[PDB]
Amino acid sequence: ADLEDNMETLNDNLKVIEKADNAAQVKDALTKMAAAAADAWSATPPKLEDKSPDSPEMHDFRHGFWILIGQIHDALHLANEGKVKEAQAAAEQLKCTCNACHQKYR
Amino acid sequence: ADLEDNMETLNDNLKVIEKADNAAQVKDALTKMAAAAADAWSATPPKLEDKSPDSPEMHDFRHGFWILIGQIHDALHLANEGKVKEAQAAAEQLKCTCNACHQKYR
Amino acid sequence: ADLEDNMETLNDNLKVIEKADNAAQVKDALTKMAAAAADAWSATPPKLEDKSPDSPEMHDFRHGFWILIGQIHDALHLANEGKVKEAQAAAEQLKCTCNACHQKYR
Amino acid sequence: ADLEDNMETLNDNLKVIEKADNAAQVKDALTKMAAAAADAWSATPPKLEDKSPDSPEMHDFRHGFWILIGQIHDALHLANEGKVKEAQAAAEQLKCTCNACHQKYR
Ligand code: HEM
Ligand code: HEM
Ligand code: HEM
Ligand code: HEM
Ligand SMILES: [Zn+2]
Ligand SMILES: [Zn+2]
Ligand SMILES: [Zn+2]
Ligand SMILES: [Zn+2]
Protein backbone atom coordinates (compact mmCIF):
# COMPACT_ATOMS: atom_id res chain seq x y z
CA ALA A 1 0.00 0.00 0.00
CA ASP A 2 0.86 3.71 -0.38
CA LEU A 3 3.40 5.07 2.17
CA GLU A 4 0.75 7.68 2.87
CA ASP A 5 -1.89 5.01 3.46
CA ASN A 6 0.56 3.20 5.76
CA MET A 7 1.22 6.43 7.66
CA GLU A 8 -2.50 7.15 8.06
CA THR A 9 -2.88 3.66 9.53
CA LEU A 10 -0.04 4.29 11.97
CA ASN A 11 -1.67 7.60 12.88
CA ASP A 12 -5.23 6.30 13.27
CA ASN A 13 -4.25 3.39 15.47
CA LEU A 14 -1.86 5.53 17.47
CA LYS A 15 -4.69 7.85 18.56
CA VAL A 16 -6.87 4.78 19.20
CA ILE A 17 -4.21 3.62 21.66
CA GLU A 18 -4.07 6.98 23.43
CA LYS A 19 -7.85 6.95 23.97
CA ALA A 20 -8.14 3.21 24.66
CA ASP A 21 -10.30 1.81 27.50
CA ASN A 22 -9.09 -1.76 27.40
CA ALA A 23 -6.02 -3.86 26.70
CA ALA A 24 -7.74 -5.42 23.68
CA GLN A 25 -8.06 -2.09 21.84
CA VAL A 26 -4.38 -1.53 22.51
CA LYS A 27 -3.45 -5.01 21.23
CA ASP A 28 -5.53 -4.74 18.06
CA ALA A 29 -4.19 -1.26 17.26
CA LEU A 30 -0.56 -2.26 17.88
CA THR A 31 -0.83 -5.32 15.64
CA LYS A 32 -2.17 -3.03 12.92
CA MET A 33 0.72 -0.62 13.40
CA ALA A 34 3.28 -3.38 13.12
CA ALA A 35 1.76 -4.43 9.76
CA ALA A 36 1.76 -0.86 8.46
CA ALA A 37 5.33 -0.36 9.69
CA ALA A 38 6.26 -3.59 7.90
CA ASP A 39 4.64 -2.74 4.58
CA ALA A 40 6.27 0.71 4.80
CA TRP A 41 9.84 -0.64 4.89
CA SER A 42 10.26 -0.98 1.12
CA ALA A 43 8.80 2.48 0.47
CA THR A 44 10.84 5.47 -0.79
CA PRO A 45 9.61 8.93 0.39
CA PRO A 46 9.33 12.02 -1.86
CA LYS A 47 12.24 13.91 -0.30
CA LEU A 48 14.50 10.99 -1.18
CA GLU A 49 13.15 10.15 -4.64
CA ASP A 50 16.37 11.31 -6.28
CA LYS A 51 18.60 9.54 -3.74
CA SER A 52 20.13 6.10 -4.26
CA PRO A 53 18.47 3.06 -2.64
CA ASP A 54 21.88 2.48 -1.03
CA SER A 55 22.47 6.06 0.10
CA PRO A 56 22.85 6.79 3.80
CA GLU A 57 19.50 8.61 3.82
CA MET A 58 17.65 5.55 2.52
CA HIS A 59 19.49 3.21 4.89
CA ASP A 60 18.70 5.57 7.76
CA PHE A 61 15.09 5.82 6.60
CA ARG A 62 14.48 2.08 6.74
CA HIS A 63 16.36 2.00 10.07
CA GLY A 64 13.70 4.22 11.62
CA PHE A 65 11.22 1.53 10.66
CA TRP A 66 13.25 -1.18 12.36
CA ILE A 67 13.31 0.96 15.52
CA LEU A 68 9.55 1.51 15.27
CA ILE A 69 8.78 -2.16 14.70
CA GLY A 70 10.95 -2.96 17.72
CA GLN A 71 9.09 -0.48 19.95
CA ILE A 72 5.73 -1.80 18.81
CA HIS A 73 7.00 -5.26 19.70
CA ASP A 74 7.63 -4.19 23.28
CA ALA A 75 4.42 -2.22 23.50
CA LEU A 76 2.47 -5.37 22.61
CA HIS A 77 4.01 -7.49 25.39
CA LEU A 78 3.06 -4.85 27.97
CA ALA A 79 -0.51 -4.68 26.60
CA ASN A 80 -0.52 -8.49 26.69
CA GLU A 81 0.33 -8.43 30.40
CA GLY A 82 -2.79 -6.33 30.87
CA LYS A 83 -0.54 -3.47 31.98
CA VAL A 84 -2.54 -0.98 29.86
CA LYS A 85 -1.29 2.29 31.31
CA GLU A 86 2.35 1.40 30.62
CA ALA A 87 1.49 -0.02 27.19
CA GLN A 88 0.16 3.46 26.46
CA ALA A 89 3.31 5.04 27.89
CA ALA A 90 5.34 2.76 25.62
CA ALA A 91 3.30 3.91 22.61
CA GLU A 92 4.09 7.48 23.63
CA GLN A 93 7.78 6.77 23.39
CA LEU A 94 7.62 5.31 19.89
CA LYS A 95 6.11 8.67 19.03
CA CYS A 96 9.66 9.91 19.79
CA THR A 97 10.41 7.79 16.67
CA CYS A 98 7.60 9.07 14.50
CA ASN A 99 8.75 12.67 15.06
CA ALA A 100 12.43 11.95 14.48
CA CYS A 101 11.97 10.45 11.03
CA HIS A 102 9.42 13.13 10.14
CA GLN A 103 11.63 16.06 11.04
CA LYS A 104 14.35 14.45 8.93
CA TYR A 105 12.64 12.95 5.84
CA ARG A 106 9.05 14.24 5.63
CA ALA B 1 4.73 -11.02 -2.18
CA ASP B 2 4.26 -14.77 -1.64
CA LEU B 3 5.40 -16.61 1.52
CA GLU B 4 7.39 -19.30 -0.27
CA ASP B 5 8.93 -16.69 -2.53
CA ASN B 6 9.90 -14.77 0.60
CA MET B 7 11.02 -17.94 2.37
CA GLU B 8 13.12 -18.76 -0.71
CA THR B 9 14.58 -15.26 -0.83
CA LEU B 10 15.27 -15.95 2.84
CA ASN B 11 16.62 -19.47 2.38
CA ASP B 12 18.80 -18.46 -0.58
CA ASN B 13 20.44 -15.45 1.08
CA LEU B 14 21.30 -17.42 4.23
CA LYS B 15 23.55 -19.73 2.19
CA VAL B 16 25.16 -16.74 0.44
CA ILE B 17 26.10 -15.38 3.89
CA GLU B 18 27.38 -18.82 4.80
CA LYS B 19 29.65 -18.89 1.74
CA ALA B 20 30.31 -15.18 2.34
CA ASP B 21 33.89 -14.09 1.74
CA ASN B 22 33.59 -10.36 2.43
CA ALA B 23 31.40 -7.63 3.98
CA ALA B 24 29.65 -6.40 0.83
CA GLN B 25 28.35 -9.91 0.23
CA VAL B 26 26.95 -10.17 3.75
CA LYS B 27 25.29 -6.73 3.77
CA ASP B 28 23.48 -7.07 0.45
CA ALA B 29 22.26 -10.55 1.43
CA LEU B 30 21.05 -9.38 4.84
CA THR B 31 19.56 -6.25 3.24
CA LYS B 32 17.57 -8.56 0.97
CA MET B 33 16.71 -10.89 3.85
CA ALA B 34 15.20 -7.97 5.73
CA ALA B 35 12.98 -6.89 2.84
CA ALA B 36 11.67 -10.44 2.51
CA ALA B 37 11.12 -10.96 6.25
CA ALA B 38 9.33 -7.63 6.29
CA ASP B 39 7.26 -8.55 3.24
CA ALA B 40 6.15 -11.87 4.72
CA TRP B 41 4.92 -10.20 7.91
CA SER B 42 1.20 -10.15 7.11
CA ALA B 43 1.07 -13.53 5.37
CA THR B 44 -1.09 -16.21 6.96
CA PRO B 45 0.64 -19.60 7.09
CA PRO B 46 -1.27 -22.59 5.72
CA LYS B 47 -1.60 -24.39 9.06
CA LEU B 48 -3.62 -21.43 10.39
CA GLU B 49 -5.84 -20.23 7.52
CA ASP B 50 -8.80 -20.91 9.83
CA LYS B 51 -7.68 -18.68 12.70
CA SER B 52 -8.66 -15.08 13.28
CA PRO B 53 -6.11 -12.37 12.32
CA ASP B 54 -6.32 -11.34 15.97
CA SER B 55 -6.37 -14.84 17.43
CA PRO B 56 -3.52 -15.75 19.78
CA GLU B 57 -2.24 -18.28 17.21
CA MET B 58 -1.45 -15.49 14.75
CA HIS B 59 0.13 -13.21 17.37
CA ASP B 60 2.62 -15.99 18.12
CA PHE B 61 3.12 -16.69 14.45
CA ARG B 62 3.92 -13.02 13.91
CA HIS B 63 6.03 -12.85 17.05
CA GLY B 64 8.59 -15.04 15.34
CA PHE B 65 9.11 -12.48 12.58
CA TRP B 66 9.70 -9.66 15.09
CA ILE B 67 12.45 -11.88 16.39
CA LEU B 68 13.90 -12.68 12.98
CA ILE B 69 13.69 -9.05 11.91
CA GLY B 70 15.44 -7.88 15.10
CA GLN B 71 18.20 -10.42 14.56
CA ILE B 72 18.72 -9.45 10.89
CA HIS B 73 18.74 -5.76 11.81
CA ASP B 74 21.59 -6.29 14.28
CA ALA B 75 23.41 -8.70 12.00
CA LEU B 76 23.41 -5.97 9.37
CA HIS B 77 25.08 -3.52 11.79
CA LEU B 78 27.80 -6.18 12.31
CA ALA B 79 28.36 -6.67 8.59
CA ASN B 80 28.31 -2.87 8.23
CA GLU B 81 31.26 -2.80 10.65
CA GLY B 82 33.24 -5.18 8.45
CA LYS B 83 32.85 -7.88 11.06
CA VAL B 84 32.30 -10.77 8.64
CA LYS B 85 32.86 -13.65 11.10
CA GLU B 86 30.57 -11.93 13.59
CA ALA B 87 27.82 -11.21 11.04
CA GLN B 88 27.97 -14.79 9.75
CA ALA B 89 27.78 -16.09 13.30
CA ALA B 90 24.70 -13.92 13.88
CA ALA B 91 23.08 -15.25 10.69
CA GLU B 92 23.77 -18.78 11.87
CA GLN B 93 21.78 -17.97 14.97
CA LEU B 94 18.83 -16.94 12.83
CA LYS B 95 18.35 -20.67 12.26
CA CYS B 96 17.74 -21.00 15.99
CA THR B 97 14.70 -18.83 15.01
CA CYS B 98 13.84 -20.18 11.54
CA ASN B 99 13.61 -23.71 12.91
CA ALA B 100 11.52 -22.64 15.92
CA CYS B 101 8.71 -21.29 13.77
CA HIS B 102 9.02 -24.19 11.33
CA GLN B 103 8.61 -26.84 14.06
CA LYS B 104 5.25 -25.21 14.71
CA TYR B 105 3.46 -23.60 11.74
CA ARG B 106 5.36 -24.85 8.66
CA ALA C 1 29.42 2.21 41.81
CA ASP C 2 26.17 3.41 43.40
CA LEU C 3 23.10 4.68 41.57
CA GLU C 4 24.09 8.37 41.83
CA ASP C 5 27.53 7.77 40.26
CA ASN C 6 26.32 5.47 37.49
CA MET C 7 23.71 8.18 36.84
CA GLU C 8 26.29 10.99 36.68
CA THR C 9 28.15 8.84 34.13
CA LEU C 10 25.01 8.50 32.06
CA ASN C 11 24.39 12.23 32.18
CA ASP C 12 27.96 13.39 31.56
CA ASN C 13 28.61 11.06 28.67
CA LEU C 14 25.17 11.89 27.27
CA LYS C 15 26.21 15.54 27.19
CA VAL C 16 29.57 14.61 25.66
CA ILE C 17 27.68 12.91 22.83
CA GLU C 18 25.45 15.96 22.22
CA LYS C 19 28.57 18.13 21.87
CA ALA C 20 30.67 15.62 19.93
CA ASP C 21 32.44 16.39 16.66
CA ASN C 22 33.47 12.88 15.64
CA ALA C 23 32.45 9.20 15.89
CA ALA C 24 35.42 8.54 18.15
CA GLN C 25 33.95 10.71 20.91
CA VAL C 26 30.46 9.26 20.65
CA LYS C 27 31.68 5.65 20.67
CA ASP C 28 33.70 6.39 23.78
CA ALA C 29 30.78 7.97 25.59
CA LEU C 30 28.32 5.24 24.58
CA THR C 31 30.72 2.61 25.86
CA LYS C 32 30.94 4.24 29.25
CA MET C 33 27.13 4.55 29.40
CA ALA C 34 26.79 0.86 28.55
CA ALA C 35 28.93 0.06 31.58
CA ALA C 36 27.18 2.52 33.91
CA ALA C 37 23.78 1.20 32.79
CA ALA C 38 24.89 -2.41 33.34
CA ASP C 39 26.25 -1.51 36.78
CA ALA C 40 23.06 0.28 37.85
CA TRP C 41 20.82 -2.73 37.11
CA SER C 42 20.39 -4.22 40.56
CA ALA C 43 20.19 -0.97 42.50
CA THR C 44 17.04 -0.11 44.44
CA PRO C 45 15.91 3.49 43.94
CA PRO C 46 15.16 5.25 47.25
CA LYS C 47 11.53 5.94 46.34
CA LEU C 48 11.23 2.14 46.27
CA GLU C 49 13.47 1.19 49.20
CA ASP C 50 10.33 0.02 51.04
CA LYS C 51 9.07 -2.17 48.18
CA SER C 52 9.99 -5.83 47.83
CA PRO C 53 12.65 -6.58 45.17
CA ASP C 54 10.09 -8.59 43.17
CA SER C 55 7.22 -6.15 43.42
CA PRO C 56 5.73 -4.76 40.21
CA GLU C 57 7.45 -1.41 40.83
CA MET C 58 10.91 -2.98 40.97
CA HIS C 59 10.19 -5.18 37.91
CA ASP C 60 9.07 -2.08 36.03
CA PHE C 61 12.03 -0.07 37.29
CA ARG C 62 14.40 -2.73 35.89
CA HIS C 63 12.45 -2.86 32.65
CA GLY C 64 13.40 0.77 32.13
CA PHE C 65 17.03 -0.39 32.03
CA TRP C 66 16.42 -3.22 29.54
CA ILE C 67 15.16 -0.59 27.13
CA LEU C 68 17.97 1.86 27.98
CA ILE C 69 20.70 -0.73 27.61
CA GLY C 70 19.17 -1.87 24.34
CA GLN C 71 19.23 1.70 22.98
CA ILE C 72 22.85 2.27 24.01
CA HIS C 73 23.70 -0.98 22.20
CA ASP C 74 22.08 0.17 18.94
CA ALA C 75 23.35 3.74 19.27
CA LEU C 76 26.94 2.41 19.51
CA HIS C 77 26.59 0.34 16.34
CA LEU C 78 25.63 3.59 14.61
CA ALA C 79 28.71 5.29 16.03
CA ASN C 80 30.90 2.35 14.96
CA GLU C 81 29.65 2.87 11.40
CA GLY C 82 30.90 6.44 11.55
CA LYS C 83 27.37 7.87 11.54
CA VAL C 84 27.83 10.72 14.02
CA LYS C 85 24.53 12.51 13.44
CA GLU C 86 22.48 9.31 13.48
CA ALA C 87 24.15 8.29 16.72
CA GLN C 88 23.39 11.66 18.22
CA ALA C 89 19.81 11.19 17.02
CA ALA C 90 19.73 7.84 18.81
CA ALA C 91 21.29 9.41 21.90
CA GLU C 92 18.49 11.95 21.92
CA GLN C 93 15.89 9.20 21.72
CA LEU C 94 17.39 7.17 24.55
CA LYS C 95 16.79 10.42 26.42
CA CYS C 96 13.03 9.72 26.20
CA THR C 97 14.02 6.70 28.34
CA CYS C 98 15.95 8.64 31.01
CA ASN C 99 12.96 11.00 31.46
CA ALA C 100 10.38 8.21 31.38
CA CYS C 101 12.01 6.45 34.30
CA HIS C 102 12.64 9.65 36.25
CA GLN C 103 9.08 10.95 36.01
CA LYS C 104 8.00 7.64 37.44
CA TYR C 105 10.71 6.84 39.96
CA ARG C 106 12.90 9.76 41.00
CA ALA D 1 30.36 -11.22 41.67
CA ASP D 2 33.12 -12.53 39.41
CA LEU D 3 32.44 -14.22 36.05
CA GLU D 4 32.46 -17.76 37.42
CA ASP D 5 29.69 -17.00 39.93
CA ASN D 6 27.62 -14.97 37.43
CA MET D 7 27.92 -18.01 35.14
CA GLU D 8 26.70 -20.50 37.80
CA THR D 9 23.68 -18.33 38.49
CA LEU D 10 22.97 -18.21 34.76
CA ASN D 11 23.45 -22.02 34.56
CA ASP D 12 21.48 -22.84 37.71
CA ASN D 13 18.47 -20.78 36.71
CA LEU D 14 18.47 -21.84 33.06
CA LYS D 15 17.93 -25.39 34.28
CA VAL D 16 15.32 -24.22 36.79
CA ILE D 17 13.39 -22.78 33.85
CA GLU D 18 13.85 -26.06 31.96
CA LYS D 19 12.30 -28.19 34.73
CA ALA D 20 9.83 -25.51 35.84
CA ASP D 21 6.26 -26.51 36.68
CA ASN D 22 4.69 -23.07 36.94
CA ALA D 23 5.27 -19.58 35.53
CA ALA D 24 6.29 -18.08 38.88
CA GLN D 25 9.48 -20.14 38.83
CA VAL D 26 10.31 -19.08 35.27
CA LYS D 27 9.81 -15.38 36.00
CA ASP D 28 11.90 -15.63 39.16
CA ALA D 29 14.57 -17.59 37.28
CA LEU D 30 14.77 -15.16 34.36
CA THR D 31 14.96 -12.16 36.68
CA LYS D 32 18.01 -13.67 38.34
CA MET D 33 19.61 -14.46 34.97
CA ALA D 34 18.99 -10.85 34.01
CA ALA D 35 20.92 -9.53 37.03
CA ALA D 36 23.69 -12.08 36.52
CA ALA D 37 24.19 -10.98 32.90
CA ALA D 38 24.27 -7.27 33.74
CA ASP D 39 26.82 -7.95 36.48
CA ALA D 40 28.98 -9.95 34.06
CA TRP D 41 29.16 -6.92 31.78
CA SER D 42 32.42 -5.38 33.02
CA ALA D 43 34.13 -8.75 33.28
CA THR D 44 37.33 -9.54 31.42
CA PRO D 45 37.35 -13.30 30.63
CA PRO D 46 40.57 -15.39 30.96
CA LYS D 47 41.32 -15.89 27.25
CA LEU D 48 41.27 -12.10 26.67
CA GLU D 49 43.33 -11.07 29.72
CA ASP D 50 46.01 -9.79 27.33
CA LYS D 51 43.62 -7.41 25.60
CA SER D 52 42.63 -3.89 26.63
CA PRO D 53 39.04 -2.82 27.51
CA ASP D 54 38.84 -0.95 24.20
CA SER D 55 39.88 -3.74 21.91
CA PRO D 56 37.67 -5.35 19.22
CA GLU D 57 37.86 -8.65 21.11
CA MET D 58 36.42 -7.07 24.27
CA HIS D 59 33.67 -5.27 22.36
CA ASP D 60 32.74 -8.50 20.65
CA PHE D 61 32.91 -10.24 24.00
CA ARG D 62 30.56 -7.68 25.58
CA HIS D 63 28.17 -7.50 22.62
CA GLY D 64 27.61 -11.14 23.51
CA PHE D 65 25.92 -9.99 26.71
CA TRP D 66 23.78 -7.33 24.96
CA ILE D 67 22.39 -10.26 22.98
CA LEU D 68 21.80 -12.47 26.05
CA ILE D 69 20.16 -9.68 28.03
CA GLY D 70 17.75 -8.83 25.22
CA GLN D 71 16.72 -12.48 24.93
CA ILE D 72 16.06 -12.73 28.67
CA HIS D 73 14.01 -9.56 28.35
CA ASP D 74 11.71 -11.18 25.78
CA ALA D 75 11.66 -14.47 27.71
CA LEU D 76 10.41 -12.68 30.83
CA HIS D 77 7.54 -10.97 28.92
CA LEU D 78 6.31 -14.33 27.62
CA ALA D 79 6.56 -15.70 31.18
CA ASN D 80 4.62 -12.65 32.37
CA GLU D 81 1.80 -13.45 29.92
CA GLY D 82 1.39 -16.93 31.32
CA LYS D 83 2.86 -18.40 28.12
CA VAL D 84 5.03 -20.86 30.04
CA LYS D 85 5.98 -23.40 27.37
CA GLU D 86 6.86 -20.62 24.92
CA ALA D 87 8.89 -19.07 27.72
CA GLN D 88 10.87 -22.31 27.92
CA ALA D 89 11.23 -22.30 24.16
CA ALA D 90 12.63 -18.77 24.32
CA ALA D 91 14.83 -19.82 27.26
CA GLU D 92 16.21 -22.81 25.39
CA GLN D 93 16.53 -20.32 22.59
CA LEU D 94 19.02 -18.05 24.38
CA LYS D 95 21.21 -21.07 24.98
CA CYS D 96 22.28 -20.44 21.36
CA THR D 97 23.94 -17.27 22.66
CA CYS D 98 25.52 -19.08 25.63
CA ASN D 99 27.33 -21.57 23.40
CA ALA D 100 28.42 -19.07 20.76
CA CYS D 101 30.36 -17.10 23.37
CA HIS D 102 31.81 -20.20 25.00
CA GLN D 103 32.89 -21.65 21.68
CA LYS D 104 34.76 -18.44 20.94
CA TYR D 105 35.98 -17.14 24.31
CA ARG D 106 35.74 -19.90 26.92
C1 HEM E 1 4.22 5.82 14.74
C2 HEM E 1 4.90 6.73 13.95
C3 HEM E 1 4.34 7.41 12.86
C4 HEM E 1 3.11 7.99 12.72
C5 HEM E 1 1.96 7.96 13.73
C6 HEM E 1 3.10 8.67 11.43
C7 HEM E 1 2.07 9.48 10.95
C8 HEM E 1 2.18 10.15 9.75
C9 HEM E 1 1.20 11.09 9.24
C10 HEM E 1 -0.08 11.54 9.93
C11 HEM E 1 1.73 11.53 8.05
C12 HEM E 1 1.16 12.60 7.13
C13 HEM E 1 0.77 12.16 5.74
C14 HEM E 1 -0.45 11.27 5.73
O1 HEM E 1 -0.37 10.14 6.27
O2 HEM E 1 -1.49 11.69 5.20
C15 HEM E 1 3.04 10.86 7.85
C16 HEM E 1 3.90 11.06 6.77
C17 HEM E 1 5.18 10.55 6.54
N1 HEM E 1 5.88 9.75 7.43
FE1 HEM E 1 5.13 9.20 9.15
N2 HEM E 1 4.28 8.49 10.75
C18 HEM E 1 5.03 7.71 11.62
C19 HEM E 1 6.31 7.29 11.45
C20 HEM E 1 7.16 7.52 10.44
C21 HEM E 1 8.51 6.99 10.43
C22 HEM E 1 9.15 6.19 11.54
C23 HEM E 1 9.09 7.43 9.27
C24 HEM E 1 10.39 7.19 8.76
C25 HEM E 1 11.37 6.39 9.32
C26 HEM E 1 8.04 8.25 8.61
C27 HEM E 1 8.14 8.89 7.42
C28 HEM E 1 7.12 9.60 6.85
C29 HEM E 1 7.22 10.30 5.59
C30 HEM E 1 8.53 10.47 4.77
C31 HEM E 1 6.00 10.88 5.36
C32 HEM E 1 5.56 11.67 4.13
C33 HEM E 1 4.96 10.81 3.00
C34 HEM E 1 4.55 11.61 1.76
O3 HEM E 1 4.62 12.86 1.80
O4 HEM E 1 4.15 10.98 0.75
N3 HEM E 1 6.87 8.28 9.34
N4 HEM E 1 3.29 10.02 8.92
C1 HEM F 1 15.73 -16.84 7.98
C2 HEM F 1 15.12 -18.01 8.39
C3 HEM F 1 14.22 -18.78 7.63
C4 HEM F 1 14.52 -19.50 6.51
C5 HEM F 1 15.89 -19.65 5.86
C6 HEM F 1 13.29 -20.11 6.07
C7 HEM F 1 13.21 -20.90 4.93
C8 HEM F 1 12.08 -21.54 4.49
C9 HEM F 1 11.99 -22.45 3.34
C10 HEM F 1 12.98 -22.58 2.17
C11 HEM F 1 10.76 -23.03 3.37
C12 HEM F 1 10.40 -24.32 2.61
C13 HEM F 1 9.16 -24.38 1.72
C14 HEM F 1 9.25 -23.46 0.51
O1 HEM F 1 10.29 -22.78 0.34
O2 HEM F 1 8.28 -23.42 -0.28
C15 HEM F 1 10.07 -22.34 4.47
C16 HEM F 1 8.72 -22.45 4.72
C17 HEM F 1 8.00 -21.77 5.69
N1 HEM F 1 8.55 -20.90 6.64
FE1 HEM F 1 10.30 -20.45 6.86
N2 HEM F 1 12.24 -19.82 6.91
C18 HEM F 1 12.79 -19.00 7.87
C19 HEM F 1 12.08 -18.39 8.91
C20 HEM F 1 10.73 -18.50 9.21
C21 HEM F 1 10.02 -17.80 10.25
C22 HEM F 1 10.57 -16.70 11.14
C23 HEM F 1 8.72 -18.21 10.20
C24 HEM F 1 7.72 -17.98 11.15
C25 HEM F 1 7.52 -16.76 11.74
C26 HEM F 1 8.66 -19.11 9.06
C27 HEM F 1 7.52 -19.67 8.50
C28 HEM F 1 7.45 -20.48 7.38
C29 HEM F 1 6.22 -21.09 6.86
C30 HEM F 1 4.79 -20.87 7.35
C31 HEM F 1 6.56 -21.89 5.81
C32 HEM F 1 5.58 -22.62 4.87
C33 HEM F 1 5.05 -21.72 3.75
C34 HEM F 1 3.94 -22.38 2.94
O3 HEM F 1 3.64 -23.57 3.18
O4 HEM F 1 3.36 -21.70 2.06
N3 HEM F 1 9.88 -19.29 8.49
N4 HEM F 1 10.89 -21.46 5.16
C1 HEM G 1 20.67 8.18 29.74
C2 HEM G 1 19.66 8.13 30.66
C3 HEM G 1 19.77 8.63 31.95
C4 HEM G 1 20.38 9.79 32.40
C5 HEM G 1 21.18 10.85 31.64
C6 HEM G 1 20.11 9.90 33.78
C7 HEM G 1 20.61 10.88 34.62
C8 HEM G 1 20.39 10.98 35.96
C9 HEM G 1 20.96 12.05 36.83
C10 HEM G 1 21.91 13.19 36.46
C11 HEM G 1 20.45 11.79 38.06
C12 HEM G 1 20.74 12.51 39.34
C13 HEM G 1 21.94 11.84 39.99
C14 HEM G 1 21.91 11.97 41.49
O1 HEM G 1 21.05 11.33 42.14
O2 HEM G 1 22.74 12.73 42.02
C15 HEM G 1 19.60 10.62 37.97
C16 HEM G 1 18.95 10.08 39.05
C17 HEM G 1 18.18 8.94 39.04
N1 HEM G 1 17.93 8.21 37.91
FE1 HEM G 1 18.60 8.50 36.08
N2 HEM G 1 19.33 8.86 34.22
C18 HEM G 1 19.13 8.07 33.10
C19 HEM G 1 18.37 6.91 33.11
C20 HEM G 1 17.75 6.35 34.21
C21 HEM G 1 16.86 5.19 34.10
C22 HEM G 1 16.48 4.57 32.76
C23 HEM G 1 16.36 4.96 35.37
C24 HEM G 1 15.47 3.98 35.87
C25 HEM G 1 15.19 2.81 35.20
C26 HEM G 1 16.95 6.01 36.21
C27 HEM G 1 16.61 6.20 37.53
C28 HEM G 1 17.06 7.22 38.34
C29 HEM G 1 16.74 7.35 39.74
C30 HEM G 1 15.66 6.57 40.47
C31 HEM G 1 17.48 8.41 40.20
C32 HEM G 1 17.63 8.84 41.66
C33 HEM G 1 19.00 8.51 42.26
C34 HEM G 1 19.04 8.62 43.79
O3 HEM G 1 18.04 9.09 44.38
O4 HEM G 1 20.07 8.22 44.40
N3 HEM G 1 17.80 6.84 35.51
N4 HEM G 1 19.57 10.11 36.66
C1 HEM H 1 22.53 -18.91 29.39
C2 HEM H 1 23.82 -18.46 29.13
C3 HEM H 1 25.01 -18.93 29.72
C4 HEM H 1 25.24 -20.01 30.55
C5 HEM H 1 24.24 -21.06 31.03
C6 HEM H 1 26.65 -20.03 30.89
C7 HEM H 1 27.22 -20.97 31.74
C8 HEM H 1 28.54 -21.07 32.11
C9 HEM H 1 29.11 -22.10 32.95
C10 HEM H 1 28.35 -23.26 33.56
C11 HEM H 1 30.46 -21.90 33.03
C12 HEM H 1 31.39 -22.89 33.73
C13 HEM H 1 32.73 -22.54 34.38
C14 HEM H 1 32.60 -22.03 35.82
O1 HEM H 1 31.46 -21.84 36.30
O2 HEM H 1 33.64 -21.81 36.47
C15 HEM H 1 30.69 -20.68 32.20
C16 HEM H 1 31.87 -20.05 31.91
C17 HEM H 1 32.05 -18.94 31.08
N1 HEM H 1 31.06 -18.25 30.38
FE1 HEM H 1 29.16 -18.68 30.20
N2 HEM H 1 27.32 -18.99 30.28
C18 HEM H 1 26.33 -18.33 29.56
C19 HEM H 1 26.58 -17.27 28.72
C20 HEM H 1 27.81 -16.72 28.41
C21 HEM H 1 27.98 -15.60 27.53
C22 HEM H 1 26.83 -14.90 26.80
C23 HEM H 1 29.33 -15.34 27.47
C24 HEM H 1 30.03 -14.36 26.73
C25 HEM H 1 29.48 -13.20 26.16
C26 HEM H 1 29.93 -16.33 28.35
C27 HEM H 1 31.24 -16.42 28.71
C28 HEM H 1 31.78 -17.31 29.64
C29 HEM H 1 33.22 -17.40 29.91
C30 HEM H 1 34.34 -16.55 29.33
C31 HEM H 1 33.38 -18.40 30.79
C32 HEM H 1 34.71 -18.84 31.39
C33 HEM H 1 35.00 -18.26 32.76
C34 HEM H 1 36.27 -18.82 33.38
O3 HEM H 1 36.88 -19.71 32.74
O4 HEM H 1 36.65 -18.38 34.48
N3 HEM H 1 28.99 -17.16 28.90
N4 HEM H 1 29.50 -20.20 31.66
ZN1 LIG I 1 10.02 -4.99 27.47
ZN1 LIG J 1 24.42 -5.67 18.16
ZN1 LIG K 1 20.09 -0.22 14.45
ZN1 LIG L 1 8.68 -10.72 22.17
Give descriptors for this structure.
homotetramer; 5 helices; Four Helix Bundle (Hemerythrin (Met), subunit A); 106 residues; mainly alpha; binds protoporphyrin IX containing FE; iron (chains A, B, C, D); signal (chains A, B, C, D); iron ion binding (chains A, B, C, D); heme binding (chains A, B, C, D); binds zinc ion
Gross CATH architecture of chain A = Up-down Bundle
Question: What is the rounded distance between the termini of chain A?
Answer: 18 Å
Order of helices and strands of chain A: HHHHH
Write down the oligomeric state: homotetramer
Q: Give the cofactors and ligands.
A: protoporphyrin IX containing FE, zinc ion
The chain pair forming the largest interface, with residue counts per chain, is: C-D, 16 and 17 residues
Largest sheet of chain A: none
Shape of chain A: elongated
Structural domain count of chain A: 1
The radius of gyration over CA of chain A amounts to: 14 Å
Helix/strand structural class of chain A? mainly alpha
CATH topology of chain A: Four Helix Bundle (Hemerythrin (Met), subunit A)
Strand coverage percent of chain A = under 5%
Number of strands of chain A: 0
Keywords (chains A, B, C, D): Electron transport, Heme, Iron, Metal-binding, Periplasm, Signal, Transport
Subunit structure (chains A, B, C, D): Monomer.
GO cellular component, one term (chains A, B, C, D): periplasmic space
GO molecular function (chains A, B, C, D): electron transfer activity; heme binding; iron ion binding
